[PDB]
Design a protein around this ligand. Structure first.
Ligand SMILES: [Zn+2]
Ligand SMILES: [Zn+2]
Ligand SMILES: [Zn+2]
Ligand SMILES: [Zn+2]
Lengths: 611, 605
């Protein structure tokens, strides 16, 4: 292996840059990173400048780690505040403390001295995520395979370039002139990157992206998969890639990682109970997680010999990213927005549109229609409060379909506040179908929220919220109807517990059904919102329907236009996707017309050349 | 697979009439073929096969079981007894694709007999089916070398037809339908045409040309996922014989392609001529050689000629029909019928929508067309060219005169104008020297009279005493005269020897008879560059023999297409040419149209 020889060259380079007294054992490419192993980690914990002075002269991302838990936990517990938990990752120990300042750098220095492990102290989450813990245990149980997969991915990233050609192009494999099954191929002569691989949203659930075409098969030709955010319509078929023999990395933000596992296991579990087609088994979710490499916002990451990736805040859901790809030594820069919201919301900061360079933007277009404004945050809230207030005060209960992550959380923040300020009546807000576990995960990723929510996490711990995922518990809400609010899955009524709630509450006109975001073509929710009163399960709906389209987590028409208009630098092309046909085409020609930027709607199975 | 062929056999045997038997059933290329020891019975009742074909939706030919076929040498002797000595048979060729023997006779009626009597007696005795043809005036050495090569390789040939055949008749496997076109070269440029037409079941490559311009080594983007692995390619279609459309077809074989190449019969012959010449000249001049001659052989073993108007299943869901393009001998417009009427797309290749000295106008009538992919060489708003009659008078008046030309294309139309001019006395007289395979190319025209228009057909000009071929001792000997010489845009060949020596005397003229592409020496000169060689030598442009539709003609072609297409796409022109023509069709004719870009894929359905 002539890659060993570039790692030796790197070892020796490093060794003559190191200060006296500091040694390393080995140097390895592990995923995106160059990793230095050391028998003296304390020395790197004390002087953070070595890694600075090292990365500097090497022009790359470098981590150090200890040369290779139950005795560590015990040695730490003597040496060290009210510690909730520990997690031994990279030779780090995460410590959860109610008072984190008391554990931190004199004392952190003394702790590393005695135990070697590097302490990362974190404030004890108000809520326990059972998913975060299961993933951590699963990663420990699979450390050997994981290290080996990182080595393989690493060496492939640092293979040498072999074409004397330069070009860049994007092929669409789903998510064009439709909402659903987003999946795109960015390719160069050296590299093929897959952005997203979603499930369909609409009439037919089985429909996948066009994965069987020469541009994607054989899957081993794929350098990486990027997941822009955790929504099923963007990650849901990533495990199918593995089923079909993909063996590279999946890159996403840390919260995406956690949500993706949650939503995936739930997808296939619900699919079994409801009796639909099950695209992959749970073993493929495990395989996807073993190949997942999280990256934080703003962390520039070599994912291929000629491609650097940087994630930025998208403002859509927890961990949602805008994906910037820097190709070559400044050959081209392309941004895939994923789903985004160019506006500060209760949970997140606005989508980012400042980049060192951007020649091409591929943007979503969900509210892309000329018509498609959505009410201001403040007005949407008052509207929700009034619909819910009125429903309760007259003895009805308010069913609000939602996704586990996305529309549910913003709705909860509004409700808790409203009840707290005596603006909706004190009444139980039931939460069904993984909403609550999804919310727990937010607590574990404070850095992915905006400043105000960060300081607050406390809304989500209100007495009002009552979770339910027991089926036995569901029936008690049903058998004793009693004025309340129900957030329940799934967000477009194509299935899930919201259908049980609906099957039983749709008859009394006193009740209300609250749509808080768009409902896509072909969905049950969409069909209801069009004033169909006969819904197949066949039972007739007399219940009030209100639409308070303020919590979708997407940029409205104005915001889509402002995002591109105010982008720095200004891009030379934009392409549109993730909207119904008219939405993509309307937004595209609007941007050409108003902003004079050449823009056009993508079509599934077309390939466009960027350079 | 044998088992599905038995199921066909046993099936056909159930419906054959009493007395009629078959031995074997094979897919050979696009056809299902029934072998029989009693061919006479199929010659008498044509209703047997014609019905079976229409029943199974597929072309069917019957052929004699080899066990009832005489050897060629005994067939030659049996024919020579049976036929009158003054029939004067020049040659024989025993086609192994069809169990037919082509007999070339000076007097063809004598070999056929009174009402076919003698042709009947010959088949009776030799099994082979005689197709008699009038002996071509010029002798094509290429045509003869190809025929001999096919005989020497009969076993591999039959086996390649079997393999290609079984692949064509594989069953469909997708529940999806779509069509799309990927461009791999020839977009916003002249040169290295190569397009991929694809469906969920099929991938078809149309053309695979060499570059024309500054850099000769430049190929189409053949190394991308849509083309590798090359076994995924069902078929290669070669629209016409020009190097900028077929010249790298043998590179495909070098890189492991093993399916068919489909083109017209004259294209086949011209392609082999021009390819062997390409690599031979590249050796002598000292440029990069992309493949060896062995790859031209391999290509020819895989070539399957189709005549115009022959509807041909090339894939489980694609039927192909060639039609006259009007550009050069054998040039085709390619119509692809996808599915059971899912979509129809025409690739025009290079074409000319006007009757010329040699050819009829490009065809633009089809049963259906939803998409047209058209050339755009003279696509600029500016790019009219003079009338045939006016072009001729101009050439006559201008006309030592060096005229760069391609082996096939510009050279032949020029030759017809010159011989006539000299004969009538428009230019008094001169030896018209012909260098670099022009003459051999012209011989090939004589072998394909059906691919010419009516008037030239009746005429076969080319045997005038004036024309003097030359291909190194002759070169050196070259006194007032005319020189047609290769290559047509001055990127190399003997015309550079002629030029290296005649460029100094201002007395001499350099005649450009067709466009010169970006990056060529001819283009540089044609722009009035005088430098390196000092270039005081008259330059005249008589742009009337390119063999392409001018701007008016391009527009007329689409404007009168029946049916009207829903989209057109443009290619094969310099950037401004492709974009200009596109938006001109959108504006004038209201048909959505746009120029293609290399490496983009467009979805048709
Ligand atoms: Zn989303
Ligand atoms: Zn989405
Ligand atoms: Zn041509
Ligand atoms: Zn051409």
């Amino acid at each position: 292996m002539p890659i060993e020889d570039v790692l030796l060259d790197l070892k020796h380079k490093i060794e003559k840059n190191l200060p006296a007294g500091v040694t390393i054992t080995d140097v390895e490419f592990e995923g995106p990173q160059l990793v230095l192993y050391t028998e003296e980690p304390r020395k790197f914990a004390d002087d953070g400048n070595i890694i600075r002075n090292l990365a500097k002269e090497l022009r790359t991302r470098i981590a150090m780690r200890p040369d290779p838990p139950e005795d560590s936990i015990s040695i730490i517990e003597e040496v060290v505040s009210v510690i909730s938990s520990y997690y031994f990752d990279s030779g780090e120990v995460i410590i959860e403390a109610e008072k984190p300042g008391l554990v931190i750098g004199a004392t952190l220095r003394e702790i590393t001295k005695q135990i070697g492990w590097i302490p990362k102290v974190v404030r004890t989450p108000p809520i326990k995520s059972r998913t975060v813990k299961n993933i951590r245990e699963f990663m420990r149980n699979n450390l050997k395979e994981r290290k080996e997969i990182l080595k393989t991915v690493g060496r492939k990233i640092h293979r040498e370039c072999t074409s004397k050609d330069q070009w860049v192009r994007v092929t669409a494999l789903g998510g064009c002139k439709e909402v659903g099954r987003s999946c795109f191929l960015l390719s160069t002569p050296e590299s093929r990157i897959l952005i997203d691989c979603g499930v369909n949203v609409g009439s037919d659930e089985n429909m996948t992206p066009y994965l069987y075409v020469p541009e994607v098969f054989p899957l081993n030709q794929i350098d990486a998969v990027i997941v822009t955010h955790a929504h099923l319509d963007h990650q849901g078929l990533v495990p199918l890639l593995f089923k079909y023999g993909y063996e590279g990395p999946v890159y996403c933000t840390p919260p995406t990682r956690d949500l993706m596992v949650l939503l995936q296991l739930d997808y296939i579990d619900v699919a079994a109970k409801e009796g639909k087609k099950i695209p992959y088994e749970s073993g493929m979710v495990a395989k996807t997680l073993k190949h997942t490499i999280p990256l934080d916002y703003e962390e520039v990451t070599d994912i291929a010999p000629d491609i650097k990736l940087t994630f930025h805040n998208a403002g859509h859901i927890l961990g949602s990213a805008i994906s910037h790809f820097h190709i070559g030594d400044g050959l081209h820069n392309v941004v895939f927005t994923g789903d985004y919201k160019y506006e500060k919301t209760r949970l997140f900061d606005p989508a980012v549109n400042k980049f060192p360079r951007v020649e091409t933007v591929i943007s979503e277009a969900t509210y892309g229609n000329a018509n498609a404004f959505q009410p201001a945050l403040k007005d949407a809230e008052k509207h929700l409060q009034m619909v819910v207030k009125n429903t309760i005060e007259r003895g009805g209960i308010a069913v609000i379909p939602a996704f586990a992550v996305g529309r549910s959380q913003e709705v909860m923040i509004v409700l808790e506040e409203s009840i707290r300020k005596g603006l909706i009546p004190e009444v139980p807000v039931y939460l069904d179908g993984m909403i609550w576990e999804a919310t727990a995960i937010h607590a574990t990723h404070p850095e992915y929220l905006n400043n105000d929510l960060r300081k607050l996490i406390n809304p989500f711990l209100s007495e009002c919220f009552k979770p339910v995922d027991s089926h036995e518990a569901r029936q008690k809400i049903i058998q004793n109807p009693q004025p309340c609010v129900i957030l329940a899955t799934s967000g477009m009524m194509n299935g899930g517990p919201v259908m049980e709630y609906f099957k039983a509450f749709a008859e009394d006109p006193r009740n209300t059904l609250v749509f808080v975001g768009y409902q896509a073509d072909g969905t049950i929710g969409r069909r209801i919102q069009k004033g169909w009163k006969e819904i197949p399960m066949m039972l007739k709906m007399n219940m009030e329907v209100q639409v308070v389209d303020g919590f979708s987590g997407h940029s409205d028409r104005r915001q889509l236009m402002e995002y591109v208009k105010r982008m720095q630098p200004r891009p030379e092309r934009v392409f549109t996707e993730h909207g119904d046909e008219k939405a993509c085409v309307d937004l595209a020609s609007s941007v050409y017309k108003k902003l004079k930027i050449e823009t056009r709607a993508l079509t599934n199975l077309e390939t466009v050349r960027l350079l």
